[PDB]
């Protein structure tokens, strides 16, 4: 299968991290980029490419225009106001505020903000741009009759909704690639979000749609970020009833039971006929994890890729979280070999 | 007019804050509440008294009981938790999110919370209880029969919302006031916020109300904090129809632009026959003042007090913000100076 990946992740390479009240290095940092390649191409998988270069046609139909537009010029106003940190919202239109969208930076950064553990630097949107451009490619591929590629996206993607940048996260990449799919022809798509954090953005794009089916496995939201969506309740609305299904579970979980929700997930996504599946794969559910509290193991990720391939539709994998450890390659690259085997 | 003011103010003395991306020694600082009493005592203004305590009786009727519990024991779960910094929260309920409470300390001082720009500190909720104390003291001389107040109170509180801390900000002083007031027997009373930041906080807590009046002058939410209120079209929902009154100005405004502003806002109160008027007092509006771009001068707080007492209803003067230079004492003293005259 070939693997996607531009050098241009690098562009994004921020100072700062909000973390336990201090600002620290960010988890999500080059070094993952290199080691995923690394460990992927080590397994057999060298077949890696750069994307071709995207404009905003497919993006436009999963973001709000103005958040694009946000994005395209948030750093540039920053530095502009005179700010001597990385761009960092402080304020948030939460319960009970006005719907206006302010004209300020200060304000903007807020009103497209879910989370302030996530700054904007320079070269943020430029490297967007380019994980997008993998996410798009690969998409391109599963719609050229491919039944598996690899998106070695950074930065990720699944915590950036239709108007709200991140968790790290600025292009939702799997919207992008699931839309990219239906302009080429598919009526049906199904993301599958197997990293350890509830695809929050992904859920909101297409929360009111039928057309694409999200389903997702992760940390219960009451005790893991993002915290506020990823019930199980949260089954969809208007059109998108019953398209969307999440799987919460809770501290300590392993394989034996996760294993259960993926089960389950792949029995809704076949039900609902997807005609490919966009796996947002992140390896932040390994039992080493820094941030994260489920329990899989290295040979784990190999079963993981052999049953979604199972399913017997193409799949676009799209990487999401997973931090820390050397195992991070080790781990997505085995889902691979779970895809391939 | 007697001033009361508790030492305790100083258990909140929080190391860091959020600001241009940069963790910075916070502007809401002991050393305020130092200079506004030095200049109080040196205008005449020597009759200085420490509130009694309270307990939550009042305080319980304007914020929810949940978020009070939560404030309680927020530092102490940070600290239990592992974290190495202040207590800051980074994800929060932003739009189309679910309206669930979770039960970890990261998800709850997200949910509630509305600014990242405070930071929780060991004595935090200790100094916000005496400084409700120190309001609600003031109330009760109001009450009592005294034309007018001063509460020297420290941590502000018009940010302090029904559920949400923010903006230095955790219990809405004003509001526990206006409370009071009307616990002792006022059917109307009205809170007047002069403050150069929008009392999103009080006007959040008497929205739907229609026994409290909240007026605020403010600088436009388009372009300050805290952004996501404050438009001149809020003017109350429910019970609350008609008896919210935002008056949002722009970058550089005087005295001459901002008075007439006064004026009206002065007149809607007289209209409404506010019993008695919560003056939520900040000197952020002051020419030199670090974070806030009007253009007050310090014999424009004579003015101020003067034509407020004018409205010849006992007032209750409630120390908010105001930063930077020890000509924050002055100005407010000039406030006190002309409601006393
Ligand atoms: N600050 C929490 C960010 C979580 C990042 C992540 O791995 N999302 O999948
Ligand atoms: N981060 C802006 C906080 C300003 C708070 C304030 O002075 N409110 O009155
Ligand atoms: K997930
Ligand atoms: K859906
Ligand atoms: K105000
Ligand atoms: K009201
Ligand atoms: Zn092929
Ligand atoms: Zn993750
Ligand atoms: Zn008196
Ligand atoms: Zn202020």
């Given at each position: 299968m070939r693997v996607i990946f531009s050098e241009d992740h690098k562009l994004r390479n921020a100072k700062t991290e909000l973390y336990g009240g201090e600002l620290v290095?960010?988890?999500?940092?080059?070094?993952?980029?290199?080691?995923?390649?690394?460990?992927?191409?080590?397994?057999?998988?060298?077949?890696?490419?750069?994307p071709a270069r995207h404009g905003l046609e497919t993006v436009?139909?999963?973001?709000?225009?103005?958040?694009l537009n946000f994005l395209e010029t948030a750093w540039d106003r920053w530095k502009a106001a005179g700010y001597k940190?990385?761009?960092?919202?402080?304020?948030?239109?939460?319960?009970?505020?006005?719907?206006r969208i302010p004209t300020d930076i200060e304000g903007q950064i807020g009103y497209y903000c879910n989370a302030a553990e996530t700054a904007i630097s320079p070269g943020t949107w430029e490297?967007?741009?380019?994980?997008?451009?993998?996410?798009?490619?690969?998409?391109?591929?599963?719609?050229?009759?491919?039944?598996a590629?690899?998106?070695?996206?950074?930065?990720?993607?699944?915590?950036?909704?239709?108007?709200?940048?991140?968790?790290?996260?600025?292009?939702?990449?799997?919207?992008?690639?699931?839309?990219?799919?239906?302009?080429?022809?598919?009526?049906?798509?199904?993301?599958?979000?197997?990293?350890?954090?509830?695809g929050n953005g992904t859920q909101d794009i297409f929360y009111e749609r039928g057309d694409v089916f999200f389903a997702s496995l992760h940390g219960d939201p009451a005790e893991a970020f993002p915290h506020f969506l990823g019930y199980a309740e949260e089954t969809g609305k208007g059109a998108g009833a019953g398209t969307t299904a999440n799987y919460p579970m809770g501290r300590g979980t392993p394989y034996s039971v996760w294993g259960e929700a993926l089960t389950?997930?792949?029995?809704?996504?076949?039900?609902?006929?997807a005609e490919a599946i966009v796996v947002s794969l992140?390896?932040?559910?390994?039992?080493?994890?820094?941030?994260?509290?489920?329990?899989?193991?290295?040979p784990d990720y190999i079963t993981m890729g052999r049953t979604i391939a199972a399913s017997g539709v193409p799949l676009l994998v799209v990487m999401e979280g997973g931090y820390g450890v050397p195992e991070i390659g080790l781990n997505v690259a085995n889902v691979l070999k779970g895809v391939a085997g």
């Open positions: 290095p960010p988890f999500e940092a080059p070094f993952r980029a290199e080691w995923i390649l690394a460990a992927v191409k080590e397994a057999g998988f060298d077949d890696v490419v750069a436009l139909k999963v973001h709000d225009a103005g958040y940190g990385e761009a960092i919202a402080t304020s948030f239109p939460v319960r009970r505020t006005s719907p490297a967007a741009l380019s994980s997008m451009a993998s996410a798009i490619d690969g998409a391109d591929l599963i719609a050229a009759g491919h039944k590629a690899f998106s070695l996206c950074r930065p990720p993607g699944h915590h950036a909704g239709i108007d709200m940048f991140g968790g790290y996260c600025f292009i939702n990449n799997a919207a992008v690639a699931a839309q990219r799919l239906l302009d080429k022809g598919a009526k049906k798509i199904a993301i599958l979000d197997v990293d350890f954090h509830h389950d997930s792949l029995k809704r996504i076949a039900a609902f006929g992140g390896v932040d559910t390994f039992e080493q994890d820094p941030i994260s509290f489920f329990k899989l193991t290295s």
